[PDB]
Amino acid sequence: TRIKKISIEGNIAAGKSTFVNILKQLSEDWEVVPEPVARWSNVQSTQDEFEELTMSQKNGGNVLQMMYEKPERWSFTFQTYACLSRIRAQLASLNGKLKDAEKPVLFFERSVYSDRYIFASNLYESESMNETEWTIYQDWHDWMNNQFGQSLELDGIIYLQATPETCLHRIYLRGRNEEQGIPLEYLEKLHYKHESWLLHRTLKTNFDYLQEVPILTLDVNEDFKDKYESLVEKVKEFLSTL
Amino acid sequence: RIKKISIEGNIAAGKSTFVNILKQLSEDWEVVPEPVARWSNVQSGGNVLQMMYEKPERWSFTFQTYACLSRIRAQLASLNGDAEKPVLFFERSVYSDRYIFASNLYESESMNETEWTIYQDWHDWMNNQFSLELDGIIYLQATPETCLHRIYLRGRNEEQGIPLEYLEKLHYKHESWLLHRTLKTNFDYLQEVPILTLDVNEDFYESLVEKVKEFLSTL
Numbered sequence: 001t002r003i004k005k006i007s008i009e010g011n012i013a014a015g016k017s018t019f020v021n022i023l024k025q026l027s028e029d030w031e032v033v034p035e036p037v038a039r040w041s042n043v044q045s046t047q048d049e050f051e052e053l054t055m056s057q058k059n060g061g062n063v064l065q066m067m068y069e070k071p072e073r074w075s076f077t078f079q080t081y082a083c084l085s086r087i088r089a090q091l092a093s094l095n096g097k098l099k100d101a102e103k104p105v106l107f108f109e110r111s112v113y114s115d116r117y118i119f120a121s122n123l124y125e126s127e128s129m130n131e132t133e134w135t136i137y138q139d140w141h142d143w144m145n146n147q148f149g150q151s152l153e154l155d156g157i158i159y160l161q162a163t164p165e166t167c168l169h170r171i172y173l174r175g176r177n178e179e180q181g182i183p184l185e186y187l188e189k190l191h192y193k194h195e196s197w198l199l200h201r202t203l204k205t206n207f208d209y210l211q212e213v214p215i216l217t218l219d220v221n222e223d224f225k226d227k228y229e230s231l232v233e234k235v236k237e238f239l240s241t242l
Numbered sequence: 243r244i245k246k247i248s249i250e251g252n253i254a255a256g257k258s259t260f261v262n263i264l265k266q267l268s269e270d271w272e273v274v275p276e277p278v279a280r281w282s283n284v285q286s287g288g289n290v291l292q293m294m295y296e297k298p299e300r301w302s303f304t305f306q307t308y309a310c311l312s313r314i315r316a317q318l319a320s321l322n323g324d325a326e327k328p329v330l331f332f333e334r335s336v337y338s339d340r341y342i343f344a345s346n347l348y349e350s351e352s353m354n355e356t357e358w359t360i361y362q363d364w365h366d367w368m369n370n371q372f373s374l375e376l377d378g379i380i381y382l383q384a385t386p387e388t389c390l391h392r393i394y395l396r397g398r399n400e401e402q403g404i405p406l407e408y409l410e411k412l413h414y415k416h417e418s419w420l421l422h423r424t425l426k427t428n429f430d431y432l433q434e435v436p437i438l439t440l441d442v443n444e445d446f447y448e449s450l451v452e453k454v455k456e457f458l459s460t461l
């Protein structure tokens with residue numbers, strides 16, 4: 001409970017990775033849990049202790065690609081594993097980083113809440129998950145959180161706000177293969193969910209504390225150098241209020 | 243302190259019937275049933291059991307994840323909620339979920355390589371967190387023909403189309419895991435858990451119940 005937990009939220013290619021990985025260098029007390037995107041593009045489970053000595057860990061399926069190619073078939077599968085992989089990364093880093101730090105802060109790239117309330121919810125609303133899939137999913141997520149929830153509770157949220165058009169541009173800059181067919185319209189739906197959750201705060205979750213969690217909203221539409229100074233100043237001022 | 247004993251066996255071998263009888267021998271003895279009701283009426287209603295049998299290539303992964311999720315939830319709940327020698331009997335376990343049912347689906351191509359890899363990762367992680375380790379297993383052994391008859395007897399709508407060949411496959415995995423002990427899991431302690439095998443092919447027992455009473459005293 002000593003470690004402050006801050007989630008960085010924003011649409012696909014808003015610049016969360018870029019920002020927080022540059023941000024964390026400012027303090028030895030600051031670390032980041034990246035999102036497990038690579039685990040989704042190359043799906044692998046653990047090898048047997050003898051088998052790994054003679055067999056390579058091969059590249060597996062790309063469930064990320066599967067979800068984008070056929071959302072109505074693969075959404076449930078993808079969202080389940082996205083959330084599983086995140087909880088795993090976040091719980092291990094909480095248990096193992098920043099043991100001694102004076103004022104330790106762990107920044108999470110997204111959270112289990114955006115997994116459910118933004119991404120999966122948007123899939124359900126789009127009829128990419130039917131009623132049964134959506135029910136199973138929330139049942140699972142609810143249960144995981146009653147177990148592995150207290151430890152993962154956020155002290156604050158930093159919302160990196162970029163327009164859908166900026167995000168689409170940045171998807172192209174970044175060049176991640178599975179995202180190259182994403183339409184403006186999809187990013188726009190994701191944009192609206194983040195705005196409802198983080199800016200207007202009209203989106204109600206099953207997690208009551210989140211109605212109160214402090215939120216810092218940052219505009220990241222400009223080129224990185226143009227606003228970075230003010231952004232840093234704002235983050236520092238925000239962290240000192242938690 | 244609670245002793246945990248899993249009852250294993252093919253579909254309709256008689257596990258619910260057997261453990262419901264067994265339970266009455268002692269107030270120190272409780273059961274955790276397989277949450278089948280929750281599978282045929284998916285609530286927070288869809289029938290994911292039926293979906294799995296009707297369209298296995300579409301719904302197998304989804305069913306297995308929920309089956310195992312609902313099992314873990316129920317077992318952890320019973321553990322947490324003044325008995326001299328407490329015994330908890332689980333109808334099936336997280337191991338049979340993965341190594342008998344989910345594995346059979348993958349072998350039948352009802353789950354693809356990606357689905358199976360995700361399932362296994364999820365199961366590995368879910369059980370590394372979780373207390374549920376067994377002190378013994380009771381294997382109720384019935385032939386696939388006995389099991390098919392008992393499916394019909396019971397009359398669960400979702401199950402009525404199951405062919406003998408599907409039950410034969412499940413039978414072979416059971417015998418490999420529990421009789422021959424040739425099925426390997428990534429769960430080391432399981433190779434040492436004692437197993438009581440009980441033949442339940444005949445019409446129902448008194449004796450079989452007594453045999454358990456005593457197996458437990460060796461644990």
Ligand SMILES: Nc1ncnc2c1ncn2[C@@H]1O[C@H](COP(=O)(O)OP(=O)(O)O)[C@@H](O)[C@H]1O
Pocket residue numbers: 010011012013014015016017018019170171173174175220221222223224225
């Ligand atoms: N402020 C910015 N100005 C110009 N490019 C940016 C900026 N922020 C991020 N980028 C670029 O946008 C792409 C997406 O950034 P990334 O951090 O990977 O986003 P996220 O982690 O939100 O998906 C990357 O190619 C990165 O170089």
Ligand SMILES: Nc1ncnc2c1ncn2[C@@H]1O[C@H](COP(=O)(O)OP(=O)(O)O)[C@@H](O)[C@H]1O
Pocket residue numbers: 251252253254255256257258259260392393395396442443444445446
């Ligand atoms: N030994 C037995 N002899 C005759 N009927 C049995 C016997 N064991 C179970 N049954 C009946 O067989 C059907 C399946 O039993 P059940 O306990 O629901 O199986 P399981 O829990 O293994 O799926 C039920 O209708 C039950 O009454």
Ligand SMILES: Nc1ccn([C@@H]2C[C@@H](O)[C@H](CO)O2)c(=O)n1
Pocket residue numbers: 012035037079082083114115116119120179
């Ligand atoms: N639960 C989540 C989290 C992230 N995403 C997408 C998949 C990728 O294209 C990016 C990765 O940040 O976002 C997603 O679709 N669902």
Ligand SMILES: Nc1ccn([C@@H]2C[C@@H](O)[C@H](CO)O2)c(=O)n1
Pocket residue numbers: 253254276278291306309310338339340343344401
């Ligand atoms: N993990 C599991 C556990 C049980 N089953 C089947 C489904 C029903 O027909 C019966 C219920 O015992 O077993 C199953 O298919 N997968």
